């Protein structure tokens, strides 16, 4: 068998986590698959904890993950994350995001999951 | 009843570690005195040469020394914390990596490492 689909390559995986992490930071909720939510949580938490000092080095580090969304660009998402979201989690010892399980999709039966920011 | 495996591993390694263990980077020339044992006595045989690598964490700390005799280059892997082995750093040199593999490819005037390091 040949001419197969490109597949869930490593580059595709990094882009998927990047896309989801930008959206959950913009809006605050993501409705994805459970196995995909369980992978974006690591990157989401890591980004938030490194963005607690708000120095220019941390902006360059965060910019390797954020992507343009509908509600914010790549430069106001920077301001939204570093001025609104991250300052809230100033003394929480990790665990800023929660993943909970919804029902199965009607057309796939895959287990859905909501990823949210725990206030 | 929590078991920190590394602490116990560190303790067994500490049973036979050495006190001084002088330091050297990748590109350094050292003099290693092997205390070879014959039927009787010891003949201190020197293996002065250039370091190529330093890997390991404890009793398993090893380093690579390269020498050239009669135009033939020979590389020899020593263990740092091994008895009857003495290491004496001679020249400290500048390299931009930890494993300088190209030294086993470059030879002659191009196999000389500039002094100084930080």
């Amino acid at each position: 068998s040949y001419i197969n689909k490109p597949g869930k390559t490593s580059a595709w995986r990094v882009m998927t986590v990047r896309q989801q992490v930008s959206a959950v930071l913009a809006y605050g909720k993501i409705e994805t698959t459970l196995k995909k939510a369980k992978n974006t949580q690591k990157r989401l938490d890591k980004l938030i904890t490194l963005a607690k000092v708000d120095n220019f080095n941390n902006r360059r580090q965060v910019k390797k993950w954020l992507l343009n969304t509908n509600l914010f660009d790549v430069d106001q998402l920077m301001d939204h994350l570093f001025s609104k979201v991250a300052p809230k989690y100033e003394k929480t010892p990790g665990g800023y995001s929660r993943v909970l399980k919804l029902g199965p999709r009607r057309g796939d039966a895959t287990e859905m999951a909501i990823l949210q920011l725990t206030d | 009843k929590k078991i920190n495996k590394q602490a116990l591993i560190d303790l067994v390694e500490q049973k036979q570690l050495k006190a001084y263990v002088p330091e050297f980077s990748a590109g350094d020339e050292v003099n290693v005195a092997i205390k070879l044992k014959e039927k009787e006595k010891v003949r201190i045989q020197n293996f002065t040469g250039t370091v190529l690598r330093r890997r390991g964490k404890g009793i398993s700390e090893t380093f690579i020394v390269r020498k050239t005799t009669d135009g033939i280059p020979i590389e020899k892997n020593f263990q740092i914390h091994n008895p009857n082995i003495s290491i004496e750093l001679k020249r400290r040199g500048k390299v931009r990596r930890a494993y300088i593999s190209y030294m086993r490819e470059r030879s002659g005037k191009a196999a000389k490492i500039k002094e100084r390091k930080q």
Binding site: - | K1, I3, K5, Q6, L8, I9, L11, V12, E13, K15, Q16, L17, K18, A19, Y20, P22, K37, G58, I59, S60, Q79, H81, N82, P83, N84, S86
Partner: protein, 230 residues
């Protein structure tokens, strides 16, 4: 014979340099003091064995039947129970450590559960040869090997029982014999055993007296580093 046995948990593997100028790889085993939970006699049972208790745990993590047995026998609650054959000469309810059992450098054999590897093929399991890769080839490259014994009514016409094919590999008890004990650490309750021990780090391990060399003890002593400070 006079078989002595102890249980411990493998924590990792290291090396030590020894006198006579040898570098000996060793395995490190954390050995809790084992408690003799039962003794079974030749006259009363038709065989002789000693059952000990080890790997102590709190009472709330143990099931009701087992904790009832432990409180009836007046023992420390432990979740692990196993016996060794032909182990005699120990009173019930006595703490046993390898220092009283084995010598400094005697030969012992060790049994442990091998590291699980799952469903492996014939080549990785039975050390079979791989078919040719070039010069023209076919769909089966990693072939197990023809299982034909005889075609026709006058011959077997069946694959013989116990054939060597793919299947489960790993997670199986295996014993390595004639391993020399290197050192004892009373304070840390830590036994040093030469060679490599099967099983993942943290699994259970049984150390027994070697049946090939029961009383043989080969001397071994470590090296003292004379390295003077600068």
């Amino acid at each position: 014979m006079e078989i002595r046995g102890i249980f411990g948990v493998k924590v990792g593997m290291s090396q030590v340099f020894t006198t006579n100028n040898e570098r000996l790889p060793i395995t490190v085993i954390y050995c809790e003091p084992n408690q003799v939970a039962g003794v079974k006699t030749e006259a009363k049972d038709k065989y002789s064995a000693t059952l000990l208790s080890f790997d102590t745990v709190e009472n709330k993590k143990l099931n009701k039947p087992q904790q009832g047995f432990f409180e009836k026998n007046n023992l420390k609650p432990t979740k692990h129970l196993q016996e060794i054959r032909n182990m005699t000469g120990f009173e019930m309810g006595q703490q046993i450590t390898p220092q009283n059992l084995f010598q400094v450098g005697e030969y012992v054999d060790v049994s442990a559960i091998s590291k699980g590897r799952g469903f492996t093929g014939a080549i990785k399991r039975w050390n079979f040869k791989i078919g040719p890769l070039g010069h023209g080839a076919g769909y089966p490259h990693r072939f197990q090997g023809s299982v034909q014994a005889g075609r026709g009514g006058a011959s077997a016409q069946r694959v013989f029982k116990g054939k060597k094919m793919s299947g489960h590999y790993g997670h199986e008890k295996v014993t390595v014999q004639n391993l020399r004990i290197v050192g004892f650490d009373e304070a840390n309750m830590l036994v040093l055993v030469s060679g490599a021990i099967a099983g993942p780090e943290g699994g259970v391990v049984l150390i027994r007296t070697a049946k090939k060399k029961p009383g043989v003890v080969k001397p071994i002593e470590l090296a003292v580093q004379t390295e003077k400070a600068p």
